[PDB]
Amino acid sequence: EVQLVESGGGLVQPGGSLRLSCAASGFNISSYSIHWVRQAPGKGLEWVASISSYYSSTYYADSVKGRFTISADTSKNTAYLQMNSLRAEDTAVYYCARQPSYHMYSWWVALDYWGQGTLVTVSSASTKGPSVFPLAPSSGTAALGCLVKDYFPEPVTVSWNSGALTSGVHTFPAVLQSSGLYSLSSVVTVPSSSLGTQTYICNVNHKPSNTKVDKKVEP
Amino acid sequence: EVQLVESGGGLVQPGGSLRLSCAASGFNISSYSIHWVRQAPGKGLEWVASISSYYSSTYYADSVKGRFTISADTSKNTAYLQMNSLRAEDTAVYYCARQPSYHMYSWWVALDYWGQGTLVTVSSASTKGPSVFPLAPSSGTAALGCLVKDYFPEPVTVSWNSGALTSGVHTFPAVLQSSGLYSLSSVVTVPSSSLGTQTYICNVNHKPSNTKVDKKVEP
Amino acid sequence: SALQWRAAGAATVLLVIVLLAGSYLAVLAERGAPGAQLITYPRALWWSVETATTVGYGDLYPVTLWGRLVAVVVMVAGITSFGLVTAALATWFVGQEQQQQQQFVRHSEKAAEEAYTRTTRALHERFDRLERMLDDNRR
Amino acid sequence: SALQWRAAGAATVLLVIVLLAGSYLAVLAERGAPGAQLITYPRALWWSVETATTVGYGDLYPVTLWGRLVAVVVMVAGITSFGLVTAALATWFVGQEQQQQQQFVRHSEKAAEEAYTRTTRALHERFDRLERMLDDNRR
Amino acid sequence: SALQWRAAGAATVLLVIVLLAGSYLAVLAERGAPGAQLITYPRALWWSVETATTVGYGDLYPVTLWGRLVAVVVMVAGITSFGLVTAALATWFVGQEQQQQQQFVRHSEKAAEEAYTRTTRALHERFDRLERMLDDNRR
Amino acid sequence: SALQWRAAGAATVLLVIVLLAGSYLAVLAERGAPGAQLITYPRALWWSVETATTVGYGDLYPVTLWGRLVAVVVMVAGITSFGLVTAALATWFVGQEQQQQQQFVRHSEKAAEEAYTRTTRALHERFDRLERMLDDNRR
Amino acid sequence: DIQMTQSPSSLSASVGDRVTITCRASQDVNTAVAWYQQKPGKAPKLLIYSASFLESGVPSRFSGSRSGTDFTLTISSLQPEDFATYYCQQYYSYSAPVTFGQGTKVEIKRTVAAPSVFIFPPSDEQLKSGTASVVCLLNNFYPREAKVQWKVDNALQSGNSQESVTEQDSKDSTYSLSSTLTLSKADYEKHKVYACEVTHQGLSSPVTKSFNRGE
Amino acid sequence: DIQMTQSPSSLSASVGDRVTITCRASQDVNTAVAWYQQKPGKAPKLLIYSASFLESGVPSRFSGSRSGTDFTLTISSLQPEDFATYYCQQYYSYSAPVTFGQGTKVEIKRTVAAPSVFIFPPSDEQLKSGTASVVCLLNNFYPREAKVQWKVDNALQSGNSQESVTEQDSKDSTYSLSSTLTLSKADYEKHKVYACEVTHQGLSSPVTKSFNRGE
């Protein structure tokens, strides 16, 4: 039962080094070709380098030349995209996919199965647990929330009370600041009678900072 | 103004050697291919070997293998078909022609221009010179001629007088005798008033044996 | 089995047969010649030692006829053993130089051959590619 | 500075052990033999000089038994140091033959590398030609 | 007819001309010199023997002027024979080493010849393919 | 002349500087030693002749101190001259063997390279071929 | 080295509609173009491979076309779950076979909705550190066209507010914009009337929520 | 190694007719077949090259066809000078790559004729050597079917006469037979009445020429 497994993405100060590994699992990469396609963070789909381990060939994008090195070992079953002079734009969701090689007719399906991707974050910014602040409401329709606001790197989870307050919850997309850390607020609309009757907490877990935390919304 | 020129054919006892030369004259054999196509004597068209001097290639017919060697020199401008273990069946009319090579769309014409061919006679039989006899007429319509009778090998020419009598001239096809020599008669119908008024001679040249012979012809 | 010690330690033992046929046949034919101290064998042993290596001292030597022809055969082996010892220090010094030759040419050749190889694969990958453009596009 | 001076300057020092076991053992066993001047060590030093190189003058030499077996050992080292100074020099001049061999290979290689892979350059070249004759002429 | 035996067995016969000119010319110029036992030719024959191979015993030798210049010519021919008999045996065995080199080149050649051209075999083999793929899928 | 003569005829003239320093410095330091006949230079010239080639007769030699250190220098030059002549008979014989190496490799290589070449052309013919079973056929 | 131009960036339409996306190439690809539908979050999904035929598990409502150089993905009877971003890729070139285009993002067009403004004063403990952060919130609205401007004592603030919008909702299909007005405590106390200006496609009167610091 | 089968060996027809020759191949030639018309004596002439188009100087009355494997040369409005032998060759194979077929010889079919006889007595100087040779001549006739029998003093002669016919003429299209009766002078003088019997397709009475020796 086929599938792919990107691994190794992480956090690296600019001009550093990284090794991603596309662990394959349903075919022999022996007769297939592995692609590495990185989508930026919130931008469109981009191809980086690929390798047909059957012919003794490789291919890199014109976007990266003396820096990346896709290579593969067939004894084990994986491809590796090697990143060397990571620039601040190399941050993204790195996927890897297959396409049959030039063999029968299979090559005409092209990127048949992708993996889920690992995130590569290139930035001089260092790791930080998030500090959350309460967004108190005031006045049937109330709006209150949290604010996980100086945190890095991506990403963080914001749930209310372990899957409790599920509707009316709008956790926005993280937005990088000129500081070098990410910030994001989660708001939720609730009835005005629940402010004194029902309790509201936001559970926050930044995982890169091995830290999680919850906060109660006291008006 | 293009044209080809086979040369070298001759007389050779069986299992001997011969070198034909296809002198070219309108193109550079540099970028063309030269064929050697020998017709048997009175049998159909046969291809022997060919050479594309542009690619460094050669090709021989399955009819001849360790015996022929088509080769070419481009400094001078000729192809050479080399015959080595001449068997008694190798007797024929050796032509040579061209075909453009694989270059643009010229390769699609087939043999575009042939030469006139040289005659190769492989036989243990030796050269002989027969004698022409007068075929005297008798009685507006008269029929008289010559007879080139015991001669070897093919062929002989029979013209009347330095281009004098051109029409009414039927020089027949040589016919081998149980002797081992060829024989042939040339007859010509003329008016009956020219027997005493106009003179009739038959010019005969057997060039293989070196015999030149004119022969006056009276009633 | 060493064939270097069956060549060197085998002609150095045949060298001793010229050291034992020199203080033995030119010392016997030297027991009664006008000026013979090369008389005894145990004492005329210092004879074929200064002959081979052609040291040539002078405290032991013949003056007879058939004691001289059985002497020139001794100085011939001395040189025959020097070229042999030379042939066994150029057997193991060049067997090292042989480790060199095999490691070098086997490295450059297997390396180059496969460089040709890769070029070939360049082809395969290409032929197969064209094939795909072929038949699989018209049907 | 490789195993040349640890080969040459290591067997010429083992040569001195045949020059010091030659005016030392055959000079002690020569302090009371009928005709012994090879008695004193400082005077019997001109002994192991004419032995090695096999010069063999005669003003110094033994007549004993164990003063002769400790002498044939000296003229053996004389030739061993000759085959050694033979290996030291062949090391020098073949060290230059392996240097001209460095130039030879780099010129034979760099001419088999860049003007060769240049063929692959064209291999793809004519392939991109049909890839283009086909779908430049068909779709 | 052997430029080997007309080179070796021709310079060893020319060697005998340095053995017949050494007990002949420095033995005549030694018949009346202060200390001349190299006075007769049959006894002074043990002279050019210890000269060539530079054995140098001392029973026979000159003290004259033109008996010394006709002596340094003898020890020179001894060394001339050494290099000759040294390059006559490094000829045979290296003539068997260039034979093991023939098996070496013939095995590395016949393997770069048939297994290699085997590649052109298929070069046409994949060419004959699209030559078909085209007009086997078109016309 | 040829540097072979400015190498050989230049080290054989530097040899005479070891023959004119041996019957000159150890013959002077031999004019009053306990057993000195190596006193005169012209008579003691037969001294540095039996030293170098290591013939070693015995009619001329020292018993002094600084007449022995200026003697071990003469027998060292004798062997230096022998390896030199053995190096120049392998300079001209292996210069012929050099004519062999150059004539062989250049023939094998130029031939092999063009064998590769023929395998290239093999392709040109083939590509142009298919290039004509192509657009030509379609248009 | 082939290039690709998809079309268009994004689009609007209701369910049951007929959507067609073009792509145009910079050179000759024959039919090495492929279509992928990516649903925000997960990886791309394969739709059509020879620019002609579709993957072995795709809705029959996805069609591929070709004009030699121009390819066009088409969805007849657009369903309610075909809301994703679409990538047109090609695999003909000999760079490698990948090249995708600027993708098309198919969002759905429903009835106009209401989205409320709410403001939030800087948390107290957030002023216990060095900076204070005011924050406007638009809640559930549709068109994503919204212009929230700030005003400190009715004076316009510039370049200090960052905005981020939710992704269209699975039920409401309403976009929610969030503006964040940050200023060092010092400058936050240097004024007293923090307001949040909100203009919009469906706002008669530009809703202007606000507050005074410390009330 | 491709083979070729032309069709047929030869044929008959008058001028103005429509002649079609068909040559089938032993394998897939695509269209590398060519046609040549050879006029007895000189070399072949190129007619059609892609089995499709004709040489740059050929009568428009020559057409080429193809059925993948079967090719057929066709001459509409056969002229009076198209009397030659025809060779079908191919140039597709990689034994490379000429191959011709057993050719077709197009002779012309005219009205039956009668052999026009003449006889020739042995030359005098030919009897000055050892043998004498009588010789009949049929001159311009048509069906090459002719039976010339000899008679020495009205007695039939056997196996000593050799015959040879001209090739159909370029204008007359008439075949000319020749019969040669050889006999050693001795046996030539041993008789006195040499006659030449001629039968034929267009001869009411078998024309019988003959001469009277020495007179």
Side-chain angles (χ1 to χ4, degrees), chain E residues 48-69:
Chain E
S48 53
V49 181
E50 295 302 320
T51 302
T53 64
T54 76
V55 174
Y57 276 173
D59 56 303
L60 292 167
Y61 52 56
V63 302
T64 55
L65 174 59
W66 292 161
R68 294 184 179 173
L69 292 192

PDB file of all heavy atoms in Angstrom, chain E residues 48-69:
ATOM      1  N   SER E  48      95.736 -10.732 -14.471  1.00  0.00           N
ATOM      2  CA  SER E  48      94.539 -10.067 -15.021  1.00  0.00           C
ATOM      3  C   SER E  48      93.200 -10.694 -14.552  1.00  0.00           C
ATOM      4  O   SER E  48      92.111 -10.241 -14.939  1.00  0.00           O
ATOM      5  CB  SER E  48      94.612 -10.009 -16.575  1.00  0.00           C
ATOM      6  OG  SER E  48      94.859 -11.276 -17.176  1.00  0.00           O
ATOM      7  N   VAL E  49      93.296 -11.724 -13.708  1.00  0.00           N
ATOM      8  CA  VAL E  49      92.130 -12.411 -13.159  1.00  0.00           C
ATOM      9  C   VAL E  49      91.689 -11.657 -11.891  1.00  0.00           C
ATOM     10  O   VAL E  49      90.504 -11.398 -11.677  1.00  0.00           O
ATOM     11  CB  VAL E  49      92.479 -13.897 -12.805  1.00  0.00           C
ATOM     12  CG1 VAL E  49      91.259 -14.596 -12.253  1.00  0.00           C
ATOM     13  CG2 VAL E  49      92.993 -14.645 -14.040  1.00  0.00           C
ATOM     14  N   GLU E  50      92.670 -11.300 -11.066  1.00  0.00           N
ATOM     15  CA  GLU E  50      92.451 -10.569  -9.818  1.00  0.00           C
ATOM     16  C   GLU E  50      92.341  -9.063 -10.090  1.00  0.00           C
ATOM     17  O   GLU E  50      92.113  -8.263  -9.180  1.00  0.00           O
ATOM     18  CB  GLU E  50      93.617 -10.855  -8.852  1.00  0.00           C
ATOM     19  CG  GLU E  50      93.716 -12.321  -8.386  1.00  0.00           C
ATOM     20  CD  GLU E  50      92.454 -12.828  -7.685  1.00  0.00           C
ATOM     21  OE1 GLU E  50      91.850 -12.068  -6.901  1.00  0.00           O
ATOM     22  OE2 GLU E  50      92.066 -13.991  -7.920  1.00  0.00           O
ATOM     23  N   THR E  51      92.506  -8.692 -11.357  1.00  0.00           N
ATOM     24  CA  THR E  51      92.436  -7.296 -11.791  1.00  0.00           C
ATOM     25  C   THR E  51      91.002  -6.958 -12.233  1.00  0.00           C
ATOM     26  O   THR E  51      90.367  -6.038 -11.687  1.00  0.00           O
ATOM     27  CB  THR E  51      93.418  -7.034 -12.984  1.00  0.00           C
ATOM     28  OG1 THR E  51      94.757  -7.364 -12.592  1.00  0.00           O
ATOM     29  CG2 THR E  51      93.381  -5.573 -13.418  1.00  0.00           C
ATOM     30  N   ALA E  52      90.511  -7.716 -13.219  1.00  0.00           N
ATOM     31  CA  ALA E  52      89.168  -7.540 -13.770  1.00  0.00           C
ATOM     32  C   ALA E  52      88.153  -7.504 -12.635  1.00  0.00           C
ATOM     33  O   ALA E  52      87.627  -6.432 -12.290  1.00  0.00           O
ATOM     34  CB  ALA E  52      88.841  -8.686 -14.735  1.00  0.00           C
ATOM     35  N   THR E  53      87.896  -8.681 -12.058  1.00  0.00           N
ATOM     36  CA  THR E  53      86.961  -8.827 -10.939  1.00  0.00           C
ATOM     37  C   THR E  53      87.491  -8.058  -9.722  1.00  0.00           C
ATOM     38  O   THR E  53      86.873  -8.056  -8.654  1.00  0.00           O
ATOM     39  CB  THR E  53      86.765 -10.325 -10.539  1.00  0.00           C
ATOM     40  OG1 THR E  53      88.005 -10.873 -10.062  1.00  0.00           O
ATOM     41  CG2 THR E  53      86.277 -11.139 -11.736  1.00  0.00           C
ATOM     42  N   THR E  54      88.639  -7.404  -9.902  1.00  0.00           N
ATOM     43  CA  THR E  54      89.285  -6.632  -8.848  1.00  0.00           C
ATOM     44  C   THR E  54      89.388  -7.433  -7.539  1.00  0.00           C
ATOM     45  O   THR E  54      89.124  -6.903  -6.446  1.00  0.00           O
ATOM     46  CB  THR E  54      88.542  -5.300  -8.591  1.00  0.00           C
ATOM     47  OG1 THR E  54      87.340  -5.557  -7.854  1.00  0.00           O
ATOM     48  CG2 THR E  54      88.202  -4.606  -9.919  1.00  0.00           C
ATOM     49  N   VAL E  55      89.746  -8.717  -7.669  1.00  0.00           N
ATOM     50  CA  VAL E  55      89.935  -9.602  -6.511  1.00  0.00           C
ATOM     51  C   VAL E  55      91.170  -8.995  -5.849  1.00  0.00           C
ATOM     52  O   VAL E  55      91.112  -8.551  -4.701  1.00  0.00           O
ATOM     53  CB  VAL E  55      90.231 -11.116  -6.920  1.00  0.00           C
ATOM     54  CG1 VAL E  55      90.560 -11.967  -5.669  1.00  0.00           C
ATOM     55  CG2 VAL E  55      89.023 -11.719  -7.639  1.00  0.00           C
ATOM     56  N   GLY E  56      92.269  -8.957  -6.609  1.00  0.00           N
ATOM     57  CA  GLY E  56      93.526  -8.389  -6.139  1.00  0.00           C
ATOM     58  C   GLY E  56      94.253  -9.127  -5.029  1.00  0.00           C
ATOM     59  O   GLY E  56      94.290  -8.669  -3.885  1.00  0.00           O
ATOM     60  N   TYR E  57      94.846 -10.265  -5.354  1.00  0.00           N
ATOM     61  CA  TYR E  57      95.562 -11.024  -4.349  1.00  0.00           C
ATOM     62  C   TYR E  57      96.921 -10.445  -3.964  1.00  0.00           C
ATOM     63  O   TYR E  57      97.119 -10.015  -2.819  1.00  0.00           O
ATOM     64  CB  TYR E  57      95.763 -12.462  -4.841  1.00  0.00           C
ATOM     65  CG  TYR E  57      94.569 -13.353  -4.565  1.00  0.00           C
ATOM     66  CD1 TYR E  57      94.507 -14.646  -5.074  1.00  0.00           C
ATOM     67  CD2 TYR E  57      93.524 -12.919  -3.748  1.00  0.00           C
ATOM     68  CE1 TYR E  57      93.438 -15.483  -4.770  1.00  0.00           C
ATOM     69  CE2 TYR E  57      92.461 -13.746  -3.442  1.00  0.00           C
ATOM     70  CZ  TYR E  57      92.427 -15.024  -3.952  1.00  0.00           C
ATOM     71  OH  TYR E  57      91.388 -15.851  -3.630  1.00  0.00           O
ATOM     72  N   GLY E  58      97.843 -10.422  -4.925  1.00  0.00           N
ATOM     73  CA  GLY E  58      99.174  -9.892  -4.674  1.00  0.00           C
ATOM     74  C   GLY E  58     100.390 -10.764  -4.983  1.00  0.00           C
ATOM     75  O   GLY E  58     101.520 -10.361  -4.690  1.00  0.00           O
ATOM     76  N   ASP E  59     100.178 -11.951  -5.564  1.00  0.00           N
ATOM     77  CA  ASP E  59     101.288 -12.852  -5.898  1.00  0.00           C
ATOM     78  C   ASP E  59     101.894 -12.342  -7.207  1.00  0.00           C
ATOM     79  O   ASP E  59     103.106 -12.436  -7.430  1.00  0.00           O
ATOM     80  CB  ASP E  59     100.891 -14.347  -5.787  1.00  0.00           C
ATOM     81  CG  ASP E  59      99.681 -14.731  -6.653  1.00  0.00           C
ATOM     82  OD1 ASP E  59      98.601 -14.123  -6.488  1.00  0.00           O
ATOM     83  OD2 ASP E  59      99.804 -15.660  -7.486  1.00  0.00           O
ATOM     84  N   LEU E  60     101.043 -11.787  -8.064  1.00  0.00           N
ATOM     85  CA  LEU E  60     101.484 -11.255  -9.347  1.00  0.00           C
ATOM     86  C   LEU E  60     101.084  -9.810  -9.621  1.00  0.00           C
ATOM     87  O   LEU E  60      99.892  -9.488  -9.630  1.00  0.00           O
ATOM     88  CB  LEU E  60     100.800 -12.163 -10.382  1.00  0.00           C
ATOM     89  CG  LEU E  60     101.220 -13.627 -10.492  1.00  0.00           C
ATOM     90  CD1 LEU E  60     100.206 -14.379 -11.322  1.00  0.00           C
ATOM     91  CD2 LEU E  60     102.612 -13.713 -11.097  1.00  0.00           C
ATOM     92  N   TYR E  61     102.074  -8.942  -9.819  1.00  0.00           N
ATOM     93  CA  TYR E  61     101.804  -7.543 -10.140  1.00  0.00           C
ATOM     94  C   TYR E  61     103.025  -6.732 -10.510  1.00  0.00           C
ATOM     95  O   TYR E  61     104.152  -7.057 -10.122  1.00  0.00           O
ATOM     96  CB  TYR E  61     101.027  -6.813  -9.024  1.00  0.00           C
ATOM     97  CG  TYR E  61     101.580  -6.895  -7.616  1.00  0.00           C
ATOM     98  CD1 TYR E  61     102.884  -6.494  -7.317  1.00  0.00           C
ATOM     99  CD2 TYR E  61     100.772  -7.341  -6.571  1.00  0.00           C
ATOM    100  CE1 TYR E  61     103.364  -6.542  -6.002  1.00  0.00           C
ATOM    101  CE2 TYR E  61     101.235  -7.387  -5.263  1.00  0.00           C
ATOM    102  CZ  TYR E  61     102.528  -6.991  -4.980  1.00  0.00           C
ATOM    103  OH  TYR E  61     102.972  -7.053  -3.675  1.00  0.00           O
ATOM    104  N   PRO E  62     102.807  -5.664 -11.296  1.00  0.00           N
ATOM    105  CA  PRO E  62     103.864  -4.760 -11.756  1.00  0.00           C
ATOM    106  C   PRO E  62     104.226  -3.572 -10.838  1.00  0.00           C
ATOM    107  O   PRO E  62     103.534  -3.263  -9.855  1.00  0.00           O
ATOM    108  CB  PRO E  62     103.350  -4.314 -13.131  1.00  0.00           C
ATOM    109  CG  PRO E  62     101.879  -4.239 -12.915  1.00  0.00           C
ATOM    110  CD  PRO E  62     101.584  -5.496 -12.109  1.00  0.00           C
ATOM    111  N   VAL E  63     105.345  -2.938 -11.188  1.00  0.00           N
ATOM    112  CA  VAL E  63     105.890  -1.782 -10.489  1.00  0.00           C
ATOM    113  C   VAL E  63     106.467  -0.836 -11.554  1.00  0.00           C
ATOM    114  O   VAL E  63     107.059   0.198 -11.220  1.00  0.00           O
ATOM    115  CB  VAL E  63     107.013  -2.204  -9.474  1.00  0.00           C
ATOM    116  CG1 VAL E  63     106.454  -3.212  -8.471  1.00  0.00           C
ATOM    117  CG2 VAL E  63     108.218  -2.796 -10.208  1.00  0.00           C
ATOM    118  N   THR E  64     106.276  -1.204 -12.831  1.00  0.00           N
ATOM    119  CA  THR E  64     106.762  -0.426 -13.987  1.00  0.00           C
ATOM    120  C   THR E  64     105.844   0.772 -14.339  1.00  0.00           C
ATOM    121  O   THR E  64     104.856   1.031 -13.635  1.00  0.00           O
ATOM    122  CB  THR E  64     106.972  -1.347 -15.281  1.00  0.00           C
ATOM    123  OG1 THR E  64     105.771  -2.063 -15.601  1.00  0.00           O
ATOM    124  CG2 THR E  64     108.094  -2.355 -15.057  1.00  0.00           C
ATOM    125  N   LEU E  65     106.190   1.503 -15.408  1.00  0.00           N
ATOM    126  CA  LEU E  65     105.419   2.677 -15.878  1.00  0.00           C
ATOM    127  C   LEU E  65     104.318   2.306 -16.905  1.00  0.00           C
ATOM    128  O   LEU E  65     103.128   2.588 -16.685  1.00  0.00           O
ATOM    129  CB  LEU E  65     106.371   3.728 -16.490  1.00  0.00           C
ATOM    130  CG  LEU E  65     105.727   4.957 -17.153  1.00  0.00           C
ATOM    131  CD1 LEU E  65     104.887   5.706 -16.140  1.00  0.00           C
ATOM    132  CD2 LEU E  65     106.798   5.863 -17.729  1.00  0.00           C
ATOM    133  N   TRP E  66     104.733   1.682 -18.017  1.00  0.00           N
ATOM    134  CA  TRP E  66     103.830   1.242 -19.094  1.00  0.00           C
ATOM    135  C   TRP E  66     103.296  -0.179 -18.832  1.00  0.00           C
ATOM    136  O   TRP E  66     102.780  -0.846 -19.742  1.00  0.00           O
ATOM    137  CB  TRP E  66     104.564   1.285 -20.447  1.00  0.00           C
ATOM    138  CG  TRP E  66     104.920   2.678 -20.938  1.00  0.00           C
ATOM    139  CD1 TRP E  66     105.862   2.992 -21.883  1.00  0.00           C
ATOM    140  CD2 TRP E  66     104.327   3.933 -20.535  1.00  0.00           C
ATOM    141  NE1 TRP E  66     105.894   4.354 -22.091  1.00  0.00           N
ATOM    142  CE2 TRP E  66     104.966   4.957 -21.281  1.00  0.00           C
ATOM    143  CE3 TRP E  66     103.322   4.292 -19.621  1.00  0.00           C
ATOM    144  CZ2 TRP E  66     104.630   6.319 -21.139  1.00  0.00           C
ATOM    145  CZ3 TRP E  66     102.992   5.649 -19.482  1.00  0.00           C
ATOM    146  CH2 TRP E  66     103.645   6.641 -20.239  1.00  0.00           C
ATOM    147  N   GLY E  67     103.447  -0.624 -17.581  1.00  0.00           N
ATOM    148  CA  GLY E  67     102.969  -1.928 -17.142  1.00  0.00           C
ATOM    149  C   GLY E  67     101.779  -1.698 -16.218  1.00  0.00           C
ATOM    150  O   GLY E  67     101.118  -2.650 -15.786  1.00  0.00           O
ATOM    151  N   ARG E  68     101.529  -0.414 -15.925  1.00  0.00           N
ATOM    152  CA  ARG E  68     100.417   0.054 -15.082  1.00  0.00           C
ATOM    153  C   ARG E  68      99.247   0.565 -15.947  1.00  0.00           C
ATOM    154  O   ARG E  68      98.077   0.365 -15.595  1.00  0.00           O
ATOM    155  CB  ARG E  68     100.870   1.194 -14.158  1.00  0.00           C
ATOM    156  CG  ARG E  68     101.878   0.793 -13.114  1.00  0.00           C
ATOM    157  CD  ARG E  68     102.180   1.949 -12.200  1.00  0.00           C
ATOM    158  NE  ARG E  68     103.145   1.559 -11.183  1.00  0.00           N
ATOM    159  CZ  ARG E  68     103.703   2.407 -10.331  1.00  0.00           C
ATOM    160  NH1 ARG E  68     103.384   3.691 -10.379  1.00  0.00           N
ATOM    161  NH2 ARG E  68     104.588   1.976  -9.443  1.00  0.00           N
ATOM    162  N   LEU E  69      99.573   1.233 -17.060  1.00  0.00           N
ATOM    163  CA  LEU E  69      98.569   1.760 -17.994  1.00  0.00           C
ATOM    164  C   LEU E  69      97.903   0.625 -18.788  1.00  0.00           C
ATOM    165  O   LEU E  69      96.769   0.756 -19.272  1.00  0.00           O
ATOM    166  CB  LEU E  69      99.221   2.765 -18.951  1.00  0.00           C
ATOM    167  CG  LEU E  69      99.693   4.074 -18.311  1.00  0.00           C
ATOM    168  CD1 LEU E  69     100.024   5.041 -19.424  1.00  0.00           C
ATOM    169  CD2 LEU E  69      98.614   4.675 -17.396  1.00  0.00           C
TER     170      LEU E  69
END
